[PDB]
Design a protein around this nucleic acid. Sequence first.
RNA 1: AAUUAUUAUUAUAAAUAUUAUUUUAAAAAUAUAAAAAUAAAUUAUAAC
Lengths: 203, 85, 72, 214, 79, 113, 80
Amino acid sequence: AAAAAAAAAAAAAAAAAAAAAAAAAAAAAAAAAAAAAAAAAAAAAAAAAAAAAAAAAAAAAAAAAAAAAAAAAAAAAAAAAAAAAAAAAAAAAAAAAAAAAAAAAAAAAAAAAAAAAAAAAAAAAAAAAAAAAAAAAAAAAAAAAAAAAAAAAAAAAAAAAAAAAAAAAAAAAAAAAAAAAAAAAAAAAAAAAAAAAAAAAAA
Amino acid sequence: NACHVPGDQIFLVSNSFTRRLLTRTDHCPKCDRLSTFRFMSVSGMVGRMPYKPVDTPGPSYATLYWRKQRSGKIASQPLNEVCNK
Amino acid sequence: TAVPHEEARSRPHFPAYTEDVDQPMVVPDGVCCFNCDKPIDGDDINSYVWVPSGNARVPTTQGYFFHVKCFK
Amino acid sequence: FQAGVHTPHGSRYNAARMKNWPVQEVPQNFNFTNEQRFKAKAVPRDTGKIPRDFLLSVLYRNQPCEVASLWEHCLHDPQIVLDSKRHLREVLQQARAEGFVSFEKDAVTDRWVCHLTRERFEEVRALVGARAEAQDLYSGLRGASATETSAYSESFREMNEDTKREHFRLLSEQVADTTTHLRKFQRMEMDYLPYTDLNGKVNFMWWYEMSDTR
Amino acid sequence: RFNLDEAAAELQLDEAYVASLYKPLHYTYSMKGQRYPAEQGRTSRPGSLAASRDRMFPLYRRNYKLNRELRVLDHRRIS
Amino acid sequence: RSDNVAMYFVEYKNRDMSDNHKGEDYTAGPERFFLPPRIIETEKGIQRPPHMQMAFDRWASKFKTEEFHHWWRLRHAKLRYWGVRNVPHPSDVDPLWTEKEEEEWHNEMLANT
Amino acid sequence: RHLPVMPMTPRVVFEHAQEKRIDYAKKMHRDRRLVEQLRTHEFWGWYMKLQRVRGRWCKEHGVSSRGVYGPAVDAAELWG
RNA sequence: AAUUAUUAUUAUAAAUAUUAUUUUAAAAAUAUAAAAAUAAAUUAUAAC
């Protein structure tokens, strides 16, 4: 109660003491409070076939020992993004969805692993078949962009020399659209002359 | 500290202003909106702590990771200016 | 996290609203109801459920999205 | 800002001065104490919508831009909304978290180079255009005849073909050197008022006007 | 100034629905809640007139109709 | 009387060169606490700041609605149940802000429109 | 053979009502967040008008809201 | 639960309403509660 009592209330306090039940609010003191208070509903664990898609790929890259705690390490390495909705338990949801549907059986030697792939190594061949050569195709369609993204500069390599020759187009007038109210008549004419002293000889 | 979709900002913890701590609407740094910023990072105390020096609040860890990343690159803009005027 | 040697949180093993500035966690611009294919409002409605996984599947932040009457 | 408070005497810019702020003549031998310059806190500058678009306008004319040309270009405008080279550093920190500027350095060189990000360049053209939609129309001598524009209406297409930079050797200074005569004729005044938004944070509100100094 | 009625035209709900959201849910619907026993109204004394908590708080009256559409379903909806 | 606590009347000193209370009077409060308080009769049409009323007119016009009246009366029911004596029954309770009553304040109401 | 009708057994009329009080309990919690914006949004909108009528009233009366000192103290680029 | 009292009576549904009860200008014991020492959360402390 010192944190509450001490006059100048700190910042941690203001976030800790909040147990409100509005959207995007303190979840701890929404969890901490009564079961009649929490609307902290069940963690949406994804057991998608997508969660199978980042499963049958990895094991055929490394099917050795102890693949139940450092299997998530692969998920913390092989990262376009992980796989486990909750690294904690979804990676422990990975074997049970693999153990069921007849996909993966464990391997036990000094410790428990995920090796041997349970006689489905044929469907792992034609999974990686739908990997690199699927990643190969889409990265060149943006190279079609990047075969003209070179041109993106080149189509405005002239225009940035053009529309910065347009950036004077108005100023040249406005350089003298304000000279009007200062009246040089010598620095005024020459500033229009020295521009047109070489403008007509160009082309 | 307070971050939504557009931009960012720095606030503080005026003890009267608590019901704004978690979600204070604010004019976003980007073009225009009265965006409903949320609470991301603690950034230390307003008033001092009784018989505790000014460093006892502590901003945050990630807030150090913020100005060292948001501002951060004083070596990338020592152009036209340094800490002086 | 690789907090050096199991130096994570003691009592809950997790804190509330750890600083999220590192990843903005913003809803996509292109989106779909994962099962019913309905466009989804950005951030001022509760009529869409975000499934932000460690992985990323559906839109551009790719945590799954349903409509509240589309999760069945 | 003063004559020689923080930067030695002789550091004056032909920029938008602040309203009511006199050039308070600091004597020559004056110096700070190195322990007085310790705190050295100063006034926060307006980094808002007016300077930003302005900051982009000069970064839009020059999609790459280097150190000195960062400020050496702000002198080449009819209306400026800067007061110092630190007011240039100030908005730049803002324009990074606006996603407007991701400037880098070229590895072959050793200078830092401006670049409006391509995740936003297509739209900031409207922002430089919404400044531009009446930037050309409001001109006075444009709208006084046709033979001034018609003595030049044909050069813009023949310049960038065979005499492209030939004109750019002049299109930088001579067309802008009169603005220096004009900077002594019409600056802008960064009239400001402090206030506080209902969240509580302090901020200012700047009423920018052109100074009819003459 | 912000007016709920001139606001509900932007939401199309109605007058008597936006208000029920900004007063406790026993002043419109049929849930459990006790008002205060002085608001209950009195008789007519020799001196004083009568009272009634539909003539004293016409705004706080239960909108038994709006309860029909929202929280209770009909019998002719499930035939 | 509730608790024998001596009541002091703190105030700011210089109020002649002030801006917003240049000629206000504090013998007793206003008629209904949401009006511009009494003024020294020598300065009737004195121009107050134009914004310190925009936070007042915006405010003094929430006590003018029928719902506030249904707060003002309900508040009695709350009190007599809460034991506070001397609170007359919520039946015979005059409204705070009526329509006709306001015309007296609509008297000096010809400043800008 | 006729189209299938599972009768209104007390359970299915118990779920048909649950399905109703939910959306109502959602709708309230939905447009409790709709006028909430129109109030907050219009508040600041009214306020930004207030700082601007306040502003262009000070610029006409010498009230600089800056302290007893003149403007020269702000010209110093010092706090002091 | 003797009550307008230690109290979300919660079977269900839920998530950004500031939605409306807490006196006092002194001093000790006590009661709660609290900067410093014989890699961890602890001490005891009958100390501000």
